[PDB]
């Protein structure tokens, strides 16, 4: 599940870096997928509120809208470098790579949705054990 995300995330980063460095002239900072997963998890709720709920059948134009609301300065590889958003990069792509980028972003937000649900199972199992420990004191 982290496995299919790391494929997507690395695609998303390769595409983003190419455009970001070309357009700004600045050098990307180092990738930390884990740091960026946290950022993505904060972001999913805010995209669902700002635009619409994220379902596996969410339409292209809805994703493309969400790309306006995702700031590269928040992520490891672009930390505080410039004001670029994901749409800023979509807009520099040719019409073929636009479809790939929409697919990659959509599929990445889906894997992040499944990562959120798994994480709140891990915390449920942890509460279930913590409740046992304190129900002796
Ligand atoms: Ni290009």
Domain ranges for the chain: 2-134
Resolution of the entry in angstroms:
2.5
Distance CA 5, CA 38 (A): 13
Enumerate residues 6+ apart whose C-beta is below 8 A from 43. Answer: 69, 70, 74
Rounded distance from Cα 13 to ligand 1 centre (Å): 13
Calpha distance 19→13 (Å, rounded): 10
CB 111 within 8 A of CB 8: yes
Rounded CA separation 90/100 (Å): 10
Query: 98: CA distance to ligand 1 center in Å?
Result: 10
Of 123, 110, 124, the C-alpha closest to 1 is 110
Q: Residue 82: CB partners within 8 Å, gap ≥ 6?
A: 20, 24, 26, 72, 73
> How many angstroms separate the alpha carbon of residue 92 from the centre of ligand 1?
7
What gap in Å lies between CA 52 and CA 8, rounded to an integer?
A: 22
Ligand 1 centroid to residue 50 C-alpha, Å: 29
Distance in Å, CA 85 to ligand 1 centroid: 16
Q: Helices marked H in the chain — which ranges?
A: 2-24, 33-50, 60-66, 86-90, 95-134
Ligand 1 centroid from CA 76, angstroms: 21
C-alpha angle 77-46-82 in degrees, rounded to nearest 5: 30
Torsion from C-alpha of 37, 43, 122, 4, nearest 10 degrees: -50
Q: Give whole-number Cα distances, 129 to 96, 124, 135, in Å.
A: 51, 9, 10
102 CA distance to ligand 1 middle (Å): 15
Distance 120 CA to ligand 1 centre (A): 38
Distance 101 CA to ligand 1 centre (A): 11
The size of the chain, in residues, is 137
Residues contacting residue 87 through CB under 8 Å, at least 6 positions apart? 64, 67, 68
Residue 93 Cα, ligand 1 centroid: separation in angstroms? 6
């Amino acid at each position: 599940s982290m496995d299919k995300l790391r494929v997507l995330y690395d695609e998303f980063v390769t595409i983003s870096k190419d455009n970001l460095e070309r357009e700004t002239g600045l050098s990307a900072s180092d990738v930390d997928m884990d740091f960026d997963l946290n950022i993505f998890m904060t972001l999913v709720p805010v995209l669902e509120k700002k635009v619409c709920v994220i379902t596996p059948t969410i339409e292209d134009d809805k994703i493309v809208t969400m790309m306006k609301y995702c700031s590269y300065q928040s992520f490891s590889f672009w930390f505080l470098k410039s004001g670029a958003v994901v749409k800023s990069v979509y807009n520099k792509l040719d019409d073929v790579e636009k479809e790939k980028f929409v697919a990659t972003f959509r599929d990445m937000l889906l894997n992040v949705q499944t990562l959120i649900s798994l994480n709140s199972m891990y915390t449920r199992l942890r509460q279930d054990t913590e409740d046992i420990v304190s129900d002796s004191k």
